[PDB]
Amino acid sequence: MKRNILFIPFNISYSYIEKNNNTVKFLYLYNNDYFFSINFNEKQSIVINEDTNTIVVETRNFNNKINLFNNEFNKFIYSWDNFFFNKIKFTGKGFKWKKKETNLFLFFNRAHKCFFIGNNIILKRLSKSKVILLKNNYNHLIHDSILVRTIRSNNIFTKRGLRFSRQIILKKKGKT
Amino acid sequence: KXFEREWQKIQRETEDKQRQALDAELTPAQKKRVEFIADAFIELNIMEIAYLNHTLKERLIKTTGLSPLKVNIDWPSLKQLENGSWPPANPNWFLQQEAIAKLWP
Amino acid sequence: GQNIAKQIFLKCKQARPKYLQNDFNATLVQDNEAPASYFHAKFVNGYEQKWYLHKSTEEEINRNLKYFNYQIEMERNLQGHDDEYEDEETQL
């Protein structure tokens, strides 16, 4: 059986509670700032390790949604006192940007304006051809990072244009 | 002959192949083994304690077996066993205690 | 907790040196005095930990390593370091 794994960070400390009746089982996460609880059915059995801050699950109910239950649970906790990050690049001749207080100005051979404006993000320039975004939610980040990508993306003939710093890149010959 | 039959239970019942570290502690299993030996060594007339001390120095020089734990060929002190068997044999031994008996004060 | 550490020691040396640091030295010691067999480790930017192995798995360990390796990027990229690989190293 697939025995899914629940990570817990190190800043977090947790407890596990049951009734005398033993018909209810739930779990309690608690940090300096936040606190969060969630239960387990009578058909979900559980194993814990303080050695790793990992928890293991079996499901007699055979529900396939749990694989999504993990990623929410895992990332929702690492969303406490930690960022998510991402990096963007470009390579080209008549390309540039300018950065002013989470307001990024893009000039990539287009007649129209191309301002990027970040609501509740962090943006810090490391070089002319590189910029990092930082935010606590991963899902807003990609929506924030990809808008930059859609202005210019990698040509399949030359790796000229913008791209993420970790991605599948395509290439195709041209003008041998 | 009733001893051989009884003995083979207790070694079986204490076959515990767990790896060990030689320490002061011992398993409750091993204690059933030791306690059965002492129950047999206590209830023996003195003509027999004489004999057992003679058996060992016929069995220890034979030393069929190598180990740093048990009896061992490379055990150093085996060669003396042929000479001395009982300290009551050495008449010098009889001098020591009466000599020491007067040295307590 | 023995055999789990056997396999890790191979992946530290049997593995490829490109994807390791240059000063990477893995060892093995028999410590009878320990409570349990352990996997001590040391990272670049200061981090250091130990993971006992009498109860765990090889999979529960890797997500801990990701919980460090994902952050060291967030630390070193801010310093300007490109800790990334060329695109031409592995195709599909």
């Binding site: 190190f10 800043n11 303080e50 050695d51 801050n53 006192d81 930690n82 960022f83 | 767990q18 790896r19 060990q20 570290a21 030689l22 320490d23 502690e25 011992l26 398993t27 | 409570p35 349990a36 981090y47 250091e48 930990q49 130990k50 006992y52 009498h54 109860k55 952050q71």
Partner: peptide, 22 residues
Amino acid sequence: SVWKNPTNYLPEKAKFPSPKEL
């Protein structure tokens, strides 16, 4: 003398910098 699971062995667990600190 044989494998008994320990009781009080857990080391410190490294604390990471918070975004305020960083």
